[PDB]
DNA sequence: CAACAGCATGCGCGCCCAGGGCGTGCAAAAGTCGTGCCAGC
DNA sequence: GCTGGCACGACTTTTGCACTCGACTAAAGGGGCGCGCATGCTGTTG
């Protein structure tokens, strides 16, 4: 599911410069390791996976913070 | 400065550079990378020599770290790009190069492991008794040996010596009537005059040593120091820096200033018929030299004929 | 005894590059020893 | 991808491994400049 | 807007008597001076027009503006004065190699 | 790096000929003065105690030698750059700053109200800075690392 | 006849490649050829 | 018992070391420009 336009994920988080930070911090997880995608993979690279999960509203700064606190508390 | 192609550099890659590049990219641990970096510097532009193993182990300063750890790692390093790399002794070189024959090579795998692993020390001369050792006969062993002789040695494929390091000559010796005549082909002005005087001393050397004669007539630096009255070290420095050029046997002339060289020519003549006897007889040649009037008595003059990678001693 | 790290010695994190005059003493703090002769590389030995 | 030497290596090794992460360092050519200004009697040093 | 940096100070009390100062720093020092119980610490200033090459060369960070135009001059003012860069703009960050 | 030790400390032309001249305006001298007397030419009366030439000033070197013979007394003048080092060494910014403040009050000309402020903001920079002015003319010259001068 | 203000001349910035192109003794110390001695086959 | 390698000696080769200034007679280049800042000489105000 190639993304031509990011606007839909930019409405989710204002200022795309923020999007890029969150997108890549989320994609890094799946890229290097120790995460699995919240969305069905369409064969696409991990970057698009991340932007899709942001466009779906499943992932954001707050959500990644809550997941970080949950993973640190569970460890 | 910049914006021009200043001779900033090329950054070429040698063999050790490339091996280290190859280590960077392989799944070594923190320690194993230290052993690997420890081995790749031990390697030489010639490949095979990884020098002493137990100094590789002891160089790390104990604290555990056995021999086996450097041995395994060592093997894997020996497996990198230029096929057989490092190892030791050429034997294990040919066993690592022989490690990959695809195993689909007819007759080669087994026979090659026997010949290359053990008894290869006797394969130098010829087959002979070895044919009775391995029970092989005819061309079965000869084809395996064709493969062993088809292997090549170590690395020297990385190389990175495109520079031939040419001579560029300095002074040309135009050959005259069975001899040589100078022409000099190809403060700072005072240095140039000194170089011209060095060329003049080479011309005096033409008068000092006969060209046509075997080797060169024996001369002393006191002759060239007699002609222009220059100091010995200065003349030897001019002849050491610059290299004289002649149509035949051109050389820095530093060796041109008939002595041992004539004996070397005589040794070369003896070498031509020396093929019949592998051991050779420089001592007998020394007796012949004494009969000729040289008075050589198993001296290094004969020993030089018996040295210089001569068949003498090595054949014995 | 080894575990020898050239790459790890400089991670140096800085701010504000600073600038000033160099005293002869600070020059000599940088100095590895003195160059006393003009010539560069011997033309025979091909070593410095 | 130009003058960071340790960082070019780490970069390419992580790429071959699928990391896509940078580990940026300090580019050579800055270091050079600092030596070339030290070559006049000016020190320029990086203060933490 | 960037030509209007660099005001010129009529009155005392803020130190810096009668010379080219940042308008920013002057408005910050006068703001802090009015915040203090002493209101005479504030001074009147006059803004200056600069003129865009003058205004580059006059930048607080000695690393930029060295690399703009005049390098000898720049580095001599900086070497004698002993100024620190702070790395706060985009060219410095580039030349050091860090994010902007 | 490397370094080389200089017999007679000289030059550093980076200062002095980068206009304006810090050595010129620091010592209250024209750059034709100091520029002229760096190498050869004048003898640059330095200290000049018990000397007919003003403790600070220059003179014709041949005339100065004749003047010294006429004086019958010897004045520690330095023809080389060592007089700039000596003068430069004997200069105190705080004493100069007090003199400059008196001079600024003394001056009735705005033209004179600018130069003075230049010297205040300069010398003041040397005080708060912590650099010694001496350092400007250099003794030990550092040499650049070999690999960045390739052959 | 005093210092002060103005006009003018000179010098150093920029732009920008651009192409390479390159002897004079004597004397103390040491490298090497010669010769002999010792070890290997 | 013979050959080859190496050790000891002689020789003959290598190396010490540098100051004066030496100079030397030309060898040429060579159509922008602005802009500004400072030094210097002139000029007019009292």
From Swiss-Prot, chain A:
EC number assigned by the record: 2.7.7.6
Subunit structure, interactors included: The RNAP catalytic core consists of 2 alpha, 1 beta, 1 beta' and 1 omega subunit. When a sigma factor is associated with the core the holoenzyme is formed, which can initiate transcription. The rRNA transcription and antitermination complex (rrnTAC) consists of RNAP, NusA, NusB, NusE (rpsJ), NusG, SubB, ribosomal protein S4, DNA and precursor rRNA; S4 is more flexible than other subunits.
CC per GO annotation: cytosol; cytosolic DNA-directed RNA polymerase complex; RNA polymerase complex; transcription elongation factor complex
Keywords of this entry: DNA-directed RNA polymerase, Nucleotidyltransferase, Transcription, Transferase
Family stated for the protein in its record: Belongs to the RNA polymerase subunit omega family.
Function of the molecule: Promotes RNA polymerase (RNAP) assembly. Latches the N- and C-terminal regions of the beta' subunit thereby facilitating its interaction with the beta and alpha subunits.
Species for this entry: Escherichia coli (strain K12)
Annotated protein name in UniProt: DNA-directed RNA polymerase subunit omega
Catalytic activity line of the entry: RNA(n) + a ribonucleoside 5'-triphosphate = RNA(n+1) + diphosphate
Full-sequence portion shown in this chain: 1 to 75 of 91
Gene designation per UniProt: rpoZ
Gene Ontology molecular functions: bacterial-type RNA polymerase core enzyme binding; DNA binding; DNA-directed RNA polymerase activity
Protein's GO biological process: bacterial-type flagellum assembly; bacterial-type flagellum-dependent cell motility; cell motility; cellular response to cell envelope stress; DNA-templated transcription initiation; intracellular iron ion homeostasis; nitrate assimilation; protein-containing complex assembly
Curated annotation (Swiss-Prot), chain D:
Use case: Co-administration of salinamide and rifampicin or salinamide and myxopyronin suppresses the emergence of resistance to both antibiotics.
Lineage top rank: taxon: Bacteria
Post-translational modification: Acetylated on several lysine residues in the presence of glucose.
Entry's family note: Belongs to the RNA polymerase beta chain family.
Function: DNA-dependent RNA polymerase (RNAP) catalyzes the transcription of DNA into RNA using the four ribonucleoside triphosphates as substrates. Resistance to the antibiotics salinamide A, salinamide B, rifampicin, streptolydigin, CBR703, myxopyronin, and lipiarmycin can result from mutations in this protein.
The protein's assembly and partners: The RNAP catalytic core consists of 2 alpha, 1 beta, 1 beta' and 1 omega subunit. When a sigma factor is associated with the core the holoenzyme is formed, which can initiate transcription. The rRNA transcription and antitermination complex (rrnTAC) consists of RNAP, NusA, NusB, NusE (rpsJ), NusG, SubB, ribosomal protein S4, DNA and precursor rRNA; S4 is more flexible than other subunits. In pull-down experiments interacts with CedA.
Protein name: DNA-directed RNA polymerase subunit beta
GN (gene name): rpoB
Curated annotation (Swiss-Prot), chain E:
Posttranslational mods: Acetylated on several lysine residues in the presence of glucose.
Disulfide bonds: none
Domain of life: Bacteria
Statement on biotechnological application from the UniProt entry: Co-administration of salinamide and rifampicin or salinamide and myxopyronin suppresses the emergence of resistance to both antibiotics.
Family note: Belongs to the RNA polymerase beta' chain family.
Summary of the function given for this chain in its UniProt record: DNA-dependent RNA polymerase (RNAP) catalyzes the transcription of DNA into RNA using the four ribonucleoside triphosphates as substrates.
Assembly with partners or alone: The RNAP catalytic core consists of 2 alpha, 1 beta, 1 beta' and 1 omega subunit. When a sigma factor is associated with the core the holoenzyme is formed, which can initiate transcription. The rRNA transcription and antitermination complex (rrnTAC) consists of RNAP, NusA, NusB, NusE (rpsJ), NusG, SubB, ribosomal protein S4, DNA and precursor rRNA; S4 is more flexible than other subunits.
The protein, known as: DNA-directed RNA polymerase subunit beta'
Lineage, broadest ranks: Bacteria, Pseudomonadati, Pseudomonadota, Gammaproteobacteria, Enterobacterales
Span within the parent record: 1258 to 1357 of 1407
